[PDB]
Symmetry: C2
Subunit: 165 residues, 2 copies
């Protein structure tokens, strides 16, 4: 599975993304600390996950799934965040059209403040289509999404959840 590191975790390892083996969230995280032990102190509190850390599987907080026991497929992606704080995060989504993201933002009560700019409670979401990816004769649009604000983490993951649909 792929592991995306944010904020503190990124600064502490020099890495933004890693590919690590594991059939459950726990297995992947145990391998993460075997690879970068500097993260052990912040990721685990005793045997379980540290209470202030947030781990998301395809946009879903794993705590509301099966936590460390959550099964995952080999190609799954996890997002790891240290204690919540105001910030800015970005991600490029494949085949996630602007109009569709807009519909989600509108359905969440977001207010349009410009073309590709929406304000949500505690965050501002900015998005623009970048260079499409080419797979054979198929052009796959790519959408760059940036989220910043006190609740940037929350909305950033809500968007990842939406895109997974």
């Amino acid at each position: 599975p792929k592991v995306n590191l944010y904020a503190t975790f990124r600064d502490l390892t020099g890495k933004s993304q890693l590919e690590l083996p594991g059939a459950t969230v726990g297995e992947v995280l145990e391998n993460l600390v075997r690879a970068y032990p500097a993260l052990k102190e912040e990721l685990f509190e005793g045997e379980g996950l540290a209470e202030r850390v947030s781990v998301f599987l395809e946009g879903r907080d794993v705590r509301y799934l099966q936590g460390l026991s959550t099964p995952l497929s080999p190609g799954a992606t996890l997002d790891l965040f240290p204690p919540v704080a105001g910030g800015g995060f970005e991600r490029t989504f494949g085949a996630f059209p602007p109009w569709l993201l807009e519909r989600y933002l509108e359905e969440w009560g977001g207010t349009r403040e410009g073309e590709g700019v929406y304000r949500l409670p505690g965050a501002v979401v900015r998005f623009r289509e970048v260079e499409p990816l080419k797979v054979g004769s198929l052009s796959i649009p790519q959408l760059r999404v940036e989220v910043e604000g006190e609740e940037a983490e929350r909305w950033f993951e809500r968007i990842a959840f939406a895109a997974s649909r």
Copy 2:
């Protein structure tokens, strides 16, 4: 989702794996056809799934699931076979694979060589990968026989 191409599909596209969008098996196959149109008739029969092709989701034949309606997560991996196969598994211990092979009625013919009803499984450790301070074992698994596809996929299921 990721799509692994085997035999015919691999040689034609010249690709072993592709990253394609889609929330269901059907959608991914649709985009696959878009990427390589020459596969339309070899995968679809109008709006339905072809009958000679085989599609597996994390080692499970989708025909026994929900067919084209089978839901898919972004991290899903599909293996597609047209009418020998191999994969290198990361951190898939030999003793574990062996326990599965035996549970499936397999017979140990030698070191890293087991025989199954319809196939022969060959496996060996290759150069490990390295991520940070962690060494990740790499097990290369090769499957041949009349039922190689089926067994290769059950091993993929077991590894996951």
